Write a protein that binds this DNA or RNA. Structure first.
Ligand code: MG
Lengths: 82, 106, 95, 96, 96, 87, 106, 95
DNA sequence: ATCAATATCCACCTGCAGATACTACCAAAAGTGTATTTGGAAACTGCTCCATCAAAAGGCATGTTCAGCTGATTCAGCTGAACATGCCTTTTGATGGAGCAGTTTCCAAATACACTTTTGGTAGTATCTGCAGGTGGATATTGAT
DNA sequence: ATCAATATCCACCTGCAGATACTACCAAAAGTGTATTTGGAAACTGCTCCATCAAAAGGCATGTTCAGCTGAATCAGCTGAACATGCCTTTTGATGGAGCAGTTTCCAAATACACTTTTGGTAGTATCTGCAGGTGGATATTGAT
């Protein structure tokens, strides 16, 4: 059964995040909207992450690449180096 | 011969800090007292965090500080929260909080 | 092969000073390392800029101090500044 | 033949998940979405395991925090059901 | 006796004020406020005229941007009237 | 040096009319009565933050005079960069 | 004698941009093409914004560009707007914009 | 009596290239001067960290280029890289 | 209320993945000793622009009057939560090898320095000009009706 | 519509202060030409750890059922806009003096070696334990009656 990767981010999973976010009741239109939102997040981060990679003349995205991308997106993440 | 850290009463590595300053391109020159002051400050902030994650590990019947403990220590502390307000602690979760209007009719 | 420098040991010492019967996971240590590096950078960066504004070639403890004041919320700054000043004195009152 | 009322379970879920820190997206689906997206900038790329882990912690934290704000926008509207407009409003006000 | 209906002068004002760039707070009053607040931090301070001026530009820009966000927040809640819970909502979402 | 008049309650100098003009430029049509005090409070916090950093730059440069540069640096620190003043 | 700017076919000062890269301690060494590239980039960006502001001066029947024109320029333009997402143009004003629901009738 | 530098003359040149009959007020110019400076710092700074990340002690035209790519959005990035490459090329060949 | 169905919680057992411990060990920072360089506090002072003041030119504070907006009330409908049912995707673990990362090499390109030349800023004194602020006179919007 | 009061518009019209000019100058750039140093691409390669496949492990997808939440409609109270009225405080232009900023002197403190002493990182291997994931029955929370 073929199915887009983005649809791999499932209603329950989305629902689980909302729950951790303290969300009680969820319009069924949310799930698509959330997928749009996560795509743009990843798009933004990976672009920069890669731009680092590429700059290093590498073929592998190191965690550092990601950590540095997040940092400049203003989404600093502790724990994976840096 | 004695270390600069001990010369100052510190656990944090003055010489290292000193090095990291120069090889970091912050200025052409780095004074003698700078690595000391800095290292003192980094020690202090480390103390303050461990202090409180320490308690938070205890308060949950544990004796190993995991990330969650740090997350609780930070987000329950108003100033640490501000200073790390734009930082994500990996595997830290969120604070238990439910908006009251969502609570059932009591 | 290469060396992998980290504040892990010092974090530990301090931890032991404060919570002598308490340990810390691999990942919690990593976070703590990340945090010291972060704070090191923020402070060092701010002091860097301070000297440049004043056309000074050198980063002294005066710059570290002012940086700390700019970077840290009210009380956290207060303590940090005393902690810093102390460590400097204790180092100067040393042969 | 027993049935919990609409909402009661929802909270139970909340307390459980606010209690925990496990990632809530399933690692594989996530990893594919990364590689799919990554392809758009460079072809044939290899990802460190931890790099893909970084991106997950990053992403979920971001969405959970987004949901809190979304939630507050729903509650601002005198609702309890979050809807796309709530998200759009959160995002607009954050500057995204 | 002539009378414009409530809202009609408001829109005139909006057009007028979005069309211009002049500072909207009075200079002197604003300057004393800067001096009051500064004085409470350090006494015997002086200000370059352009420092106050910079402050004033920075502040009116901050407030206007905050009034857009506030406005959107009122309109999310199906009102046309801004009230403090809108301002308060905008500031939390922004993270202030 | 001989006297300088005591400064108090100057937040009230941010009058209702001006707050309303700012709101117009911000595209606001109707304004609840309570807004004016909220805005005063909000501005005050804004200014305290900026001036605190500006004054820190001033003191550090061992000056008695707050300069546009001082303010400009302070706004940058707070991610409210300002063009037009030496920025 | 020929300026590095003229060698590079740039209006912008490559000498300066070099001097400035050194003095700001961004790194130990600053390569020879570094100021060239960056002076070009700056020159470009300024051309691009001079261009659109010029237009806005023209649309308001004015010969001289004032801050409102840079504001109009920048805020009417997806990309520059983003580049200056966290920047305040003194005396800029705002984009004329009023929300639907707030207009009279229906 | 120390002089203050500014990009005013160069800004004025480029304005003449794009809009020959158009003037710039000194306030607007100050704004322009701010923008060059701001963009200068932003790019140079992105480049600084780039070099550091990669343990390289030199900022070359290649570090500028990536910095530009990280910093600028889409069509401005593309165009800026063009203009930047074009000038290096022409400068290299001029010597 | 109680009853019972389901959820949570706290006492106890234990295997092992994760964390502690040790010592070889050994390069590489870090400390120490002396020679060399320069940065920026000090004492002095020119000069700007800040604080302060009287003159004159607009905008705020306040009360009144009511249009119309907010929020309370009611409510009918669809929409999302809960939960049944089997059913296919993810997770976990072992396994060559791709490529990052270690290491030595030597040269294009860097810093360093000294002398020559050019340019960009200012300053004193200049005449030029876009346009803000005013006029009056023509047309559009608004709200009573 | 029909009308009129008020706002909006714009086109022409001096007054000037803001911009553009030029000449004269000079300090600090910036360029230029050997002299000397090295950061890093290039070439060569050991070894992680990343891709990937195969065995084992449970959740997510769908459909049926209806509770209760959202939004529509109605509405009356009362809040916030518009506007007249009374009148004071902000703005703006001119005049000594504080302080900032530009010298210049110089020593206290930083950099530059170089050479000795250690510490912190790896790792190899051994050794240890905190807790995660069960268990069991005890108790708590929700909803039907
Ligand atoms: Mg006071």
């Amino acid at each position: 059964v073929l199915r887009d990767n983005i649809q791999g981010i499932t209603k329950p999973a989305i629902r689980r995040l909302a729950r951790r976010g303290g969300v009680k009741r969820i319009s069924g239109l949310i799930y698509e909207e959330t997928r749009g939102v996560l795509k743009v997040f990843l798009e933004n981060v990976i672009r920069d992450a890669v731009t680092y990679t590429e700059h290093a003349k590498r073929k592998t995205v190191t965690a550092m690449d990601v950590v540095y991308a997040l940092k400049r997106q203003g989404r600093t993440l502790y724990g994976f180096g840096g | 011969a004695k270390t600069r850290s001990s010369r100052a009463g510190l656990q944090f590595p003055v010489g290292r800090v000193h090095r990291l300053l120069r090889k970091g391109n912050y200025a052409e020159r780095v004074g003698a007292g700078a690595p000391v002051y800095l290292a003192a400050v980094l020690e202090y902030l480390t103390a303050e965090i461990l202090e409180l994650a320490g308690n938070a590990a205890r308060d949950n019947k544990k004796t190993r500080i995991i990330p969650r403990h740090l997350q609780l220590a930070v987000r329950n502390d108003e100033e640490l929260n501000k200073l790390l307000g734009r930082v994500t602690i990996a595997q830290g979760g969120v604070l238990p909080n439910i908006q009251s209007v969502l609570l059932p009719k009591k | 092969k290469t060396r992998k420098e980290s504040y892990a040991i010092y974090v530990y010492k301090v931890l032991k000073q404060v919570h002598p019967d308490t340990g810390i996971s691999s990942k919690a240590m990593s976070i703590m390392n990340s945090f010291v590096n972060d704070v090191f950078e923020r402070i060092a960066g701010e002091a860097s800029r301070l000297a440049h504004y004043n056309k000074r070639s050198t980063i002294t403890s005066r710059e570290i101090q002012t940086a700390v004041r700019l970077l840290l919320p009210g009380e956290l700054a207060k303590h940090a500044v005393s902690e810093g000043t102390k460590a400097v004195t204790k180092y100067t009152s040393a042969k | 033949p027993h049935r919990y009322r609409p909402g009661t379970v929802a909270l139970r879920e909340i307390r459980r998940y606010q209690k925990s820190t496990e990632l809530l997206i399933r690692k594989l689906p996530f990893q594919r979405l990364v590689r799919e997206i990554a392809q758009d900038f460079k072809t044939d790329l290899r990802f460190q395991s931890s790099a893909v882990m970084a991106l997950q912690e990053a992403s979920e934290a971001y969405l959970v925090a987004l949901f809190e704000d979304t939630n507050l926008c729903a509650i601002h509207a005198k609702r309890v059901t979050i809807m796309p407009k709530d998200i759009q409003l959160a995002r607009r006000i954050r500057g995204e």
